Amino acid sequence: QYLMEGSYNKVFLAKGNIPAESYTFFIDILLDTIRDEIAGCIEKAYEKILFAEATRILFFSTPKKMTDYAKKRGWLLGPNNYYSFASQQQKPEDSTIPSTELARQVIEYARQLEMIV
Amino acid sequence: VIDAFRLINANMMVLGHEPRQTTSNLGHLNKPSIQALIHGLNRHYYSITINYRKNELEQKMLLNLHKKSWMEGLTLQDYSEHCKHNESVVKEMLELAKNYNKAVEEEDKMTPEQLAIKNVGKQDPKRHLEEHVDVLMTSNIVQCLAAMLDTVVFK
């Protein structure tokens, strides 16, 4: 219900570790999947943001867990955020002209078109 | 229209008659309309046919064009000229578009010529719009093909 609604806060999967029959294991692998999905996206989202802000809505427990987890993903390789590489690429969609490369072979489309007539 | 003939002898006509020239050959006898031409033919000569000699080599000479035509097609048609054509095509299309719109309300019957009288004028308004779309298409085809093609090859 929560996951479909998009209230990640409400999930009851980052607290479904404590009550378990032997469920705790399954809950943990599923949790890791949830954390990743958000983690890649956030990079694109914004530039160099606080460590504390980057633990909060990254579903992390401590800045130590964030450092190791962020590093594999490609942000916070050091002790300083590196969100900035990823973020800048996304925002301008209407700027890019390698020209000939981008045109993508005008010749082919033309040739398809001409043949019928 | 050109003809070849052969003279016929006076003694030949009386005894032989003119169909004797016709034997052991093609035997086509020409009529070059009526009037003086035909009348004079009959009183004077026998006309016989023309064939053309040809050879493969002879053809090959004729067919030959230009070195320059090689680049001609390639040539990147100016945007300016293209734009003139593009403007010309959209304006005719708009005028016809209306006609097209009224036309489709009817036309439940086959026979496209009847639809042409109804929609008014020779040929259907659907066909008029296509004719214009096609002319633009031809200009466009040389330009776009040429545009990429030129840049890559000289580069």
PDB file of C-alpha atoms in Angstrom:
ATOM      1  CA  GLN A   1       0.000   0.000   0.000  1.00  0.00           C
ATOM      2  CA  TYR A   2       2.743   2.374   1.091  1.00  0.00           C
ATOM      3  CA  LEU A   3       5.131   1.520  -1.718  1.00  0.00           C
ATOM      4  CA  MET A   4       2.462   2.088  -4.437  1.00  0.00           C
ATOM      5  CA  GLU A   5       1.383   5.396  -2.761  1.00  0.00           C
ATOM      6  CA  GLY A   6       5.003   6.668  -2.737  1.00  0.00           C
ATOM      7  CA  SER A   7       5.138   7.392   0.970  1.00  0.00           C
ATOM      8  CA  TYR A   8       8.406   5.823   1.699  1.00  0.00           C
ATOM      9  CA  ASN A   9       8.319   7.105   5.179  1.00  0.00           C
ATOM     10  CA  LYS A  10       5.137   5.043   5.942  1.00  0.00           C
ATOM     11  CA  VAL A  11       6.692   1.686   4.502  1.00  0.00           C
ATOM     12  CA  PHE A  12       6.891  -0.481   7.659  1.00  0.00           C
ATOM     13  CA  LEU A  13       9.805  -2.376   6.165  1.00  0.00           C
ATOM     14  CA  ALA A  14      12.626  -0.414   8.000  1.00  0.00           C
ATOM     15  CA  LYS A  15      10.994  -1.407  11.301  1.00  0.00           C
ATOM     16  CA  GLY A  16       9.675  -4.923  10.217  1.00  0.00           C
ATOM     17  CA  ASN A  17      13.102  -6.335  11.259  1.00  0.00           C
ATOM     18  CA  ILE A  18      12.100  -6.286  14.975  1.00  0.00           C
ATOM     19  CA  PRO A  19       9.006  -8.529  14.737  1.00  0.00           C
ATOM     20  CA  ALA A  20      10.044 -11.733  12.964  1.00  0.00           C
ATOM     21  CA  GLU A  21       9.223 -15.472  12.938  1.00  0.00           C
ATOM     22  CA  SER A  22      12.486 -15.952  11.103  1.00  0.00           C
ATOM     23  CA  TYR A  23      11.345 -13.129   8.648  1.00  0.00           C
ATOM     24  CA  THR A  24      14.234 -10.821   9.611  1.00  0.00           C
ATOM     25  CA  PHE A  25      16.457 -12.099   6.824  1.00  0.00           C
ATOM     26  CA  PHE A  26      13.959 -11.491   3.969  1.00  0.00           C
ATOM     27  CA  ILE A  27      13.065  -8.022   5.298  1.00  0.00           C
ATOM     28  CA  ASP A  28      16.817  -7.071   5.163  1.00  0.00           C
ATOM     29  CA  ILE A  29      17.419  -8.021   1.505  1.00  0.00           C
ATOM     30  CA  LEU A  30      14.198  -6.295   0.543  1.00  0.00           C
ATOM     31  CA  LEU A  31      15.270  -3.180   2.545  1.00  0.00           C
ATOM     32  CA  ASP A  32      18.604  -3.039   0.743  1.00  0.00           C
ATOM     33  CA  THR A  33      16.693  -2.874  -2.576  1.00  0.00           C
ATOM     34  CA  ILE A  34      14.611   0.057  -1.349  1.00  0.00           C
ATOM     35  CA  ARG A  35      17.764   1.979  -0.221  1.00  0.00           C
ATOM     36  CA  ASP A  36      19.471   1.533  -3.592  1.00  0.00           C
ATOM     37  CA  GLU A  37      16.522   2.716  -5.595  1.00  0.00           C
ATOM     38  CA  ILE A  38      16.529   6.052  -3.793  1.00  0.00           C
ATOM     39  CA  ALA A  39      20.333   6.253  -3.549  1.00  0.00           C
ATOM     40  CA  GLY A  40      21.106   6.525  -7.349  1.00  0.00           C
ATOM     41  CA  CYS A  41      18.304   8.979  -7.964  1.00  0.00           C
ATOM     42  CA  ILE A  42      19.355  11.468  -5.249  1.00  0.00           C
ATOM     43  CA  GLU A  43      22.716  11.920  -7.076  1.00  0.00           C
ATOM     44  CA  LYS A  44      21.001  13.450 -10.139  1.00  0.00           C
ATOM     45  CA  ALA A  45      18.737  15.417  -7.850  1.00  0.00           C
ATOM     46  CA  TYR A  46      21.053  18.026  -6.372  1.00  0.00           C
ATOM     47  CA  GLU A  47      24.694  19.046  -5.930  1.00  0.00           C
ATOM     48  CA  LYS A  48      26.897  18.902  -2.771  1.00  0.00           C
ATOM     49  CA  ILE A  49      24.442  18.751   0.136  1.00  0.00           C
ATOM     50  CA  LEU A  50      25.214  18.146   3.910  1.00  0.00           C
ATOM     51  CA  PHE A  51      26.296  14.850   5.223  1.00  0.00           C
ATOM     52  CA  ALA A  52      23.363  14.928   7.698  1.00  0.00           C
ATOM     53  CA  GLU A  53      20.790  15.662   4.897  1.00  0.00           C
ATOM     54  CA  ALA A  54      22.383  12.871   2.829  1.00  0.00           C
ATOM     55  CA  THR A  55      21.749  10.293   5.752  1.00  0.00           C
ATOM     56  CA  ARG A  56      18.274  11.454   6.358  1.00  0.00           C
ATOM     57  CA  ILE A  57      16.417  10.649   3.143  1.00  0.00           C
ATOM     58  CA  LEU A  58      19.043   8.085   2.036  1.00  0.00           C
ATOM     59  CA  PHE A  59      17.471   5.683   4.592  1.00  0.00           C
ATOM     60  CA  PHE A  60      20.602   5.396   6.597  1.00  0.00           C
ATOM     61  CA  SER A  61      21.184   4.749  10.214  1.00  0.00           C
ATOM     62  CA  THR A  62      24.549   6.660  10.677  1.00  0.00           C
ATOM     63  CA  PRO A  63      27.106   8.826   8.609  1.00  0.00           C
ATOM     64  CA  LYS A  64      29.467   5.784   8.803  1.00  0.00           C
ATOM     65  CA  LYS A  65      26.926   3.533   6.972  1.00  0.00           C
ATOM     66  CA  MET A  66      26.383   6.339   4.463  1.00  0.00           C
ATOM     67  CA  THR A  67      30.124   6.734   3.631  1.00  0.00           C
ATOM     68  CA  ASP A  68      30.654   3.115   2.519  1.00  0.00           C
ATOM     69  CA  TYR A  69      27.268   2.854   0.773  1.00  0.00           C
ATOM     70  CA  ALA A  70      27.517   6.133  -1.132  1.00  0.00           C
ATOM     71  CA  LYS A  71      31.089   5.289  -2.287  1.00  0.00           C
ATOM     72  CA  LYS A  72      30.015   2.185  -4.385  1.00  0.00           C
ATOM     73  CA  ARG A  73      27.208   4.261  -5.985  1.00  0.00           C
ATOM     74  CA  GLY A  74      29.676   6.993  -7.181  1.00  0.00           C
ATOM     75  CA  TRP A  75      28.950   9.879  -4.776  1.00  0.00           C
ATOM     76  CA  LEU A  76      31.002  10.547  -1.568  1.00  0.00           C
ATOM     77  CA  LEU A  77      34.159   8.807  -2.746  1.00  0.00           C
ATOM     78  CA  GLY A  78      35.941  10.921  -0.229  1.00  0.00           C
ATOM     79  CA  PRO A  79      34.806  12.586   3.004  1.00  0.00           C
ATOM     80  CA  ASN A  80      33.197  15.245   0.825  1.00  0.00           C
ATOM     81  CA  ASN A  81      30.069  14.790  -1.230  1.00  0.00           C
ATOM     82  CA  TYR A  82      30.501  14.248  -4.953  1.00  0.00           C
ATOM     83  CA  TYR A  83      26.798  14.435  -5.932  1.00  0.00           C
ATOM     84  CA  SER A  84      27.758  17.306  -8.151  1.00  0.00           C
ATOM     85  CA  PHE A  85      29.204  15.224 -11.054  1.00  0.00           C
ATOM     86  CA  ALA A  86      25.915  13.419 -11.653  1.00  0.00           C
ATOM     87  CA  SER A  87      23.508  16.319 -10.930  1.00  0.00           C
ATOM     88  CA  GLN A  88      24.800  18.768 -13.500  1.00  0.00           C
ATOM     89  CA  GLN A  89      24.362  16.365 -16.486  1.00  0.00           C
ATOM     90  CA  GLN A  90      20.575  16.010 -16.169  1.00  0.00           C
ATOM     91  CA  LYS A  91      19.386  19.703 -15.920  1.00  0.00           C
ATOM     92  CA  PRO A  92      20.029  21.113 -19.532  1.00  0.00           C
ATOM     93  CA  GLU A  93      18.215  18.813 -22.079  1.00  0.00           C
ATOM     94  CA  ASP A  94      18.130  21.255 -24.874  1.00  0.00           C
ATOM     95  CA  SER A  95      21.824  21.926 -25.075  1.00  0.00           C
ATOM     96  CA  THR A  96      23.857  19.221 -27.035  1.00  0.00           C
ATOM     97  CA  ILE A  97      25.123  19.485 -30.719  1.00  0.00           C
ATOM     98  CA  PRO A  98      27.837  17.069 -31.814  1.00  0.00           C
ATOM     99  CA  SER A  99      25.816  17.821 -34.981  1.00  0.00           C
ATOM    100  CA  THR A 100      26.509  14.941 -37.601  1.00  0.00           C
ATOM    101  CA  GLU A 101      26.639  12.296 -34.791  1.00  0.00           C
ATOM    102  CA  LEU A 102      23.287  13.620 -33.377  1.00  0.00           C
ATOM    103  CA  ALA A 103      21.488  13.930 -36.846  1.00  0.00           C
ATOM    104  CA  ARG A 104      21.827  10.134 -36.885  1.00  0.00           C
ATOM    105  CA  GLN A 105      22.264   9.387 -40.511  1.00  0.00           C
ATOM    106  CA  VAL A 106      19.731  11.695 -42.370  1.00  0.00           C
ATOM    107  CA  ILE A 107      20.625   9.569 -45.509  1.00  0.00           C
ATOM    108  CA  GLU A 108      18.943   6.483 -44.147  1.00  0.00           C
ATOM    109  CA  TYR A 109      15.587   8.099 -43.313  1.00  0.00           C
ATOM    110  CA  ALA A 110      15.552   9.850 -46.739  1.00  0.00           C
ATOM    111  CA  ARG A 111      16.186   6.584 -48.544  1.00  0.00           C
ATOM    112  CA  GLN A 112      13.335   4.887 -46.804  1.00  0.00           C
ATOM    113  CA  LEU A 113      11.122   7.745 -47.718  1.00  0.00           C
ATOM    114  CA  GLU A 114      12.007   8.215 -51.478  1.00  0.00           C
ATOM    115  CA  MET A 115      11.636   4.575 -52.489  1.00  0.00           C
ATOM    116  CA  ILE A 116       7.800   4.364 -52.634  1.00  0.00           C
ATOM    117  CA  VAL A 117       7.554   7.350 -55.147  1.00  0.00           C
TER     118      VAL A 117
ATOM    119  CA  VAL B   1       8.912  11.241 -91.844  1.00  0.00           C
ATOM    120  CA  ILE B   2      11.408  10.233 -94.576  1.00  0.00           C
ATOM    121  CA  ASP B   3      11.025   7.592 -97.241  1.00  0.00           C
ATOM    122  CA  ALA B   4      13.354   5.825 -99.746  1.00  0.00           C
ATOM    123  CA  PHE B   5      12.215   4.787-103.133  1.00  0.00           C
ATOM    124  CA  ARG B   6      13.286   3.062-106.247  1.00  0.00           C
ATOM    125  CA  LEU B   7      12.373   3.957-109.829  1.00  0.00           C
ATOM    126  CA  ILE B   8      10.057   1.623-111.780  1.00  0.00           C
ATOM    127  CA  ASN B   9      10.414   1.013-115.490  1.00  0.00           C
ATOM    128  CA  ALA B  10       7.612   1.831-118.026  1.00  0.00           C
ATOM    129  CA  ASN B  11       7.768  -1.710-119.679  1.00  0.00           C
ATOM    130  CA  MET B  12       7.667  -3.228-116.104  1.00  0.00           C
ATOM    131  CA  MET B  13       4.300  -1.602-115.332  1.00  0.00           C
ATOM    132  CA  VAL B  14       2.407  -2.891-118.267  1.00  0.00           C
ATOM    133  CA  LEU B  15       3.550  -6.459-118.245  1.00  0.00           C
ATOM    134  CA  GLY B  16       4.647  -6.947-114.526  1.00  0.00           C
ATOM    135  CA  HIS B  17       2.693  -4.374-112.610  1.00  0.00           C
ATOM    136  CA  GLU B  18       4.119  -2.592-109.497  1.00  0.00           C
ATOM    137  CA  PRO B  19       3.637  -5.552-107.013  1.00  0.00           C
ATOM    138  CA  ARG B  20       6.612  -7.297-108.784  1.00  0.00           C
ATOM    139  CA  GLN B  21       9.084  -4.840-106.883  1.00  0.00           C
ATOM    140  CA  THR B  22       7.436  -6.144-103.579  1.00  0.00           C
ATOM    141  CA  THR B  23       8.644  -9.745-103.998  1.00  0.00           C
ATOM    142  CA  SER B  24      11.736 -11.196-102.237  1.00  0.00           C
ATOM    143  CA  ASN B  25      11.988  -8.295 -99.790  1.00  0.00           C
ATOM    144  CA  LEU B  26      10.232  -6.530 -96.859  1.00  0.00           C
ATOM    145  CA  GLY B  27       7.461  -5.152 -99.200  1.00  0.00           C
ATOM    146  CA  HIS B  28       6.024  -2.444 -97.128  1.00  0.00           C
ATOM    147  CA  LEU B  29       4.474   0.194 -99.241  1.00  0.00           C
ATOM    148  CA  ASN B  30       4.081   3.624 -97.659  1.00  0.00           C
ATOM    149  CA  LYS B  31       1.232   6.089 -97.647  1.00  0.00           C
ATOM    150  CA  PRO B  32       2.599   9.599 -96.674  1.00  0.00           C
ATOM    151  CA  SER B  33      -1.025  11.062 -96.140  1.00  0.00           C
ATOM    152  CA  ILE B  34      -3.244  11.831 -99.168  1.00  0.00           C
ATOM    153  CA  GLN B  35      -2.840  14.885-101.616  1.00  0.00           C
ATOM    154  CA  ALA B  36      -0.023  15.303-104.091  1.00  0.00           C
ATOM    155  CA  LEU B  37       2.334  13.023-102.243  1.00  0.00           C
ATOM    156  CA  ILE B  38       0.325   9.853-102.652  1.00  0.00           C
ATOM    157  CA  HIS B  39      -0.911  10.666-106.124  1.00  0.00           C
ATOM    158  CA  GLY B  40       2.706  11.370-107.353  1.00  0.00           C
ATOM    159  CA  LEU B  41       3.935   8.170-105.681  1.00  0.00           C
ATOM    160  CA  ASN B  42       1.561   6.021-107.586  1.00  0.00           C
ATOM    161  CA  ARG B  43       2.326   7.517-111.060  1.00  0.00           C
ATOM    162  CA  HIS B  44       6.121   7.492-110.521  1.00  0.00           C
ATOM    163  CA  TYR B  45       7.828   5.084-108.217  1.00  0.00           C
ATOM    164  CA  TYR B  46       7.548   2.191-105.677  1.00  0.00           C
ATOM    165  CA  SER B  47       8.278   3.208-102.143  1.00  0.00           C
ATOM    166  CA  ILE B  48      10.016   0.789 -99.836  1.00  0.00           C
ATOM    167  CA  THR B  49      10.608   0.824 -96.111  1.00  0.00           C
ATOM    168  CA  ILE B  50      13.433   1.992 -93.643  1.00  0.00           C
ATOM    169  CA  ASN B  51      15.147  -0.061 -91.008  1.00  0.00           C
ATOM    170  CA  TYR B  52      17.940   1.281 -88.735  1.00  0.00           C
ATOM    171  CA  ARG B  53      21.293  -0.365 -88.385  1.00  0.00           C
ATOM    172  CA  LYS B  54      22.680  -0.230 -84.909  1.00  0.00           C
ATOM    173  CA  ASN B  55      25.606  -1.661 -83.088  1.00  0.00           C
ATOM    174  CA  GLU B  56      26.273  -1.861 -79.322  1.00  0.00           C
ATOM    175  CA  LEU B  57      29.192   0.492 -79.492  1.00  0.00           C
ATOM    176  CA  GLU B  58      27.016   3.054 -81.333  1.00  0.00           C
ATOM    177  CA  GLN B  59      24.538   3.086 -78.467  1.00  0.00           C
ATOM    178  CA  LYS B  60      27.089   3.494 -75.832  1.00  0.00           C
ATOM    179  CA  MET B  61      28.314   6.751 -77.350  1.00  0.00           C
ATOM    180  CA  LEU B  62      24.796   8.213 -77.341  1.00  0.00           C
ATOM    181  CA  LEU B  63      23.908   7.269 -73.709  1.00  0.00           C
ATOM    182  CA  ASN B  64      27.029   9.145 -72.338  1.00  0.00           C
ATOM    183  CA  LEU B  65      26.405  12.183 -70.298  1.00  0.00           C
ATOM    184  CA  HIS B  66      28.913  14.291 -68.323  1.00  0.00           C
ATOM    185  CA  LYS B  67      31.604  13.978 -65.620  1.00  0.00           C
ATOM    186  CA  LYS B  68      29.879  16.981 -63.950  1.00  0.00           C
ATOM    187  CA  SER B  69      26.542  15.169 -63.354  1.00  0.00           C
ATOM    188  CA  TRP B  70      28.379  13.000 -60.902  1.00  0.00           C
ATOM    189  CA  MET B  71      28.617  15.841 -58.415  1.00  0.00           C
ATOM    190  CA  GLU B  72      25.326  17.455 -59.541  1.00  0.00           C
ATOM    191  CA  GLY B  73      23.059  15.104 -57.602  1.00  0.00           C
ATOM    192  CA  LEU B  74      25.229  15.269 -54.563  1.00  0.00           C
ATOM    193  CA  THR B  75      24.984  19.016 -54.445  1.00  0.00           C
ATOM    194  CA  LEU B  76      23.426  20.457 -51.382  1.00  0.00           C
ATOM    195  CA  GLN B  77      20.355  22.305 -52.493  1.00  0.00           C
ATOM    196  CA  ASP B  78      20.225  25.816 -50.887  1.00  0.00           C
ATOM    197  CA  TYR B  79      18.014  26.272 -47.846  1.00  0.00           C
ATOM    198  CA  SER B  80      16.853  29.472 -49.430  1.00  0.00           C
ATOM    199  CA  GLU B  81      15.463  27.791 -52.509  1.00  0.00           C
ATOM    200  CA  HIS B  82      14.074  24.968 -50.525  1.00  0.00           C
ATOM    201  CA  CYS B  83      12.298  27.453 -48.269  1.00  0.00           C
ATOM    202  CA  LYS B  84      10.729  29.088 -51.327  1.00  0.00           C
ATOM    203  CA  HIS B  85       9.346  25.610 -52.355  1.00  0.00           C
ATOM    204  CA  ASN B  86       8.234  24.812 -48.774  1.00  0.00           C
ATOM    205  CA  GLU B  87       6.303  28.108 -48.518  1.00  0.00           C
ATOM    206  CA  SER B  88       4.717  27.489 -51.956  1.00  0.00           C
ATOM    207  CA  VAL B  89       3.602  23.941 -50.955  1.00  0.00           C
ATOM    208  CA  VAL B  90       2.022  24.752 -47.537  1.00  0.00           C
ATOM    209  CA  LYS B  91       0.015  27.725 -49.066  1.00  0.00           C
ATOM    210  CA  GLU B  92      -1.634  25.619 -51.887  1.00  0.00           C
ATOM    211  CA  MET B  93      -2.326  22.895 -49.290  1.00  0.00           C
ATOM    212  CA  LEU B  94      -4.238  25.187 -46.999  1.00  0.00           C
ATOM    213  CA  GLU B  95      -6.540  26.361 -49.818  1.00  0.00           C
ATOM    214  CA  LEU B  96      -7.248  22.764 -50.885  1.00  0.00           C
ATOM    215  CA  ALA B  97      -7.576  21.561 -47.234  1.00  0.00           C
ATOM    216  CA  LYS B  98     -10.989  23.147 -46.955  1.00  0.00           C
ATOM    217  CA  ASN B  99     -12.150  21.424 -50.107  1.00  0.00           C
ATOM    218  CA  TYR B 100     -10.906  18.146 -48.710  1.00  0.00           C
ATOM    219  CA  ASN B 101     -12.894  18.740 -45.560  1.00  0.00           C
ATOM    220  CA  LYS B 102     -16.268  19.309 -47.325  1.00  0.00           C
ATOM    221  CA  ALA B 103     -15.425  16.427 -49.774  1.00  0.00           C
ATOM    222  CA  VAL B 104     -15.198  13.674 -47.093  1.00  0.00           C
ATOM    223  CA  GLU B 105     -18.770  14.323 -45.804  1.00  0.00           C
ATOM    224  CA  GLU B 106     -20.021  12.759 -48.961  1.00  0.00           C
ATOM    225  CA  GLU B 107     -18.056  10.226 -51.130  1.00  0.00           C
ATOM    226  CA  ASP B 108     -19.894   7.068 -50.130  1.00  0.00           C
ATOM    227  CA  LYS B 109     -19.715   5.924 -53.680  1.00  0.00           C
ATOM    228  CA  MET B 110     -16.846   4.567 -55.788  1.00  0.00           C
ATOM    229  CA  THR B 111     -15.990   5.827 -59.235  1.00  0.00           C
ATOM    230  CA  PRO B 112     -13.320   8.722 -58.358  1.00  0.00           C
ATOM    231  CA  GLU B 113     -14.028  10.790 -61.446  1.00  0.00           C
ATOM    232  CA  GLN B 114     -17.698  11.497 -60.280  1.00  0.00           C
ATOM    233  CA  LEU B 115     -16.189  12.615 -56.897  1.00  0.00           C
ATOM    234  CA  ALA B 116     -13.981  15.031 -58.924  1.00  0.00           C
ATOM    235  CA  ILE B 117     -17.077  16.810 -60.536  1.00  0.00           C
ATOM    236  CA  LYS B 118     -18.782  16.929 -57.059  1.00  0.00           C
ATOM    237  CA  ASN B 119     -15.766  18.299 -55.157  1.00  0.00           C
ATOM    238  CA  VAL B 120     -15.382  20.545 -58.216  1.00  0.00           C
ATOM    239  CA  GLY B 121     -12.812  20.498 -60.932  1.00  0.00           C
ATOM    240  CA  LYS B 122     -10.660  17.863 -62.660  1.00  0.00           C
ATOM    241  CA  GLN B 123      -9.117  15.483 -60.077  1.00  0.00           C
ATOM    242  CA  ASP B 124     -10.006  14.929 -56.364  1.00  0.00           C
ATOM    243  CA  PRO B 125      -8.878  17.416 -53.730  1.00  0.00           C
ATOM    244  CA  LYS B 126      -7.262  14.595 -51.831  1.00  0.00           C
ATOM    245  CA  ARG B 127      -5.114  13.978 -54.935  1.00  0.00           C
ATOM    246  CA  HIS B 128      -4.245  17.760 -55.338  1.00  0.00           C
ATOM    247  CA  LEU B 129      -2.967  17.879 -51.650  1.00  0.00           C
ATOM    248  CA  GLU B 130      -0.794  14.717 -52.261  1.00  0.00           C
ATOM    249  CA  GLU B 131       0.631  16.196 -55.459  1.00  0.00           C
ATOM    250  CA  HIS B 132       1.920  19.179 -53.512  1.00  0.00           C
ATOM    251  CA  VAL B 133       3.175  17.014 -50.560  1.00  0.00           C
ATOM    252  CA  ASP B 134       5.095  14.897 -53.156  1.00  0.00           C
ATOM    253  CA  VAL B 135       6.738  17.922 -54.941  1.00  0.00           C
ATOM    254  CA  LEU B 136       8.063  19.135 -51.520  1.00  0.00           C
ATOM    255  CA  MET B 137       9.085  15.571 -50.789  1.00  0.00           C
ATOM    256  CA  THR B 138      11.300  15.470 -53.930  1.00  0.00           C
ATOM    257  CA  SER B 139      13.063  18.819 -52.974  1.00  0.00           C
ATOM    258  CA  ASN B 140      13.480  17.531 -49.436  1.00  0.00           C
ATOM    259  CA  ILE B 141      14.952  14.225 -50.588  1.00  0.00           C
ATOM    260  CA  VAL B 142      17.758  15.840 -52.482  1.00  0.00           C
ATOM    261  CA  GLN B 143      18.470  18.336 -49.692  1.00  0.00           C
ATOM    262  CA  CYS B 144      18.544  16.097 -46.578  1.00  0.00           C
ATOM    263  CA  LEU B 145      20.426  13.176 -48.290  1.00  0.00           C
ATOM    264  CA  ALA B 146      22.891  15.682 -49.706  1.00  0.00           C
ATOM    265  CA  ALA B 147      23.208  17.586 -46.325  1.00  0.00           C
ATOM    266  CA  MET B 148      24.652  14.742 -44.281  1.00  0.00           C
ATOM    267  CA  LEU B 149      26.364  13.136 -47.263  1.00  0.00           C
ATOM    268  CA  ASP B 150      28.402  16.121 -48.292  1.00  0.00           C
ATOM    269  CA  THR B 151      29.641  16.962 -44.780  1.00  0.00           C
ATOM    270  CA  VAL B 152      30.845  13.444 -44.026  1.00  0.00           C
ATOM    271  CA  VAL B 153      32.581  12.639 -47.340  1.00  0.00           C
ATOM    272  CA  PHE B 154      34.776  15.848 -47.684  1.00  0.00           C
ATOM    273  CA  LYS B 155      35.585  15.928 -43.931  1.00  0.00           C
TER     274      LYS B 155
END
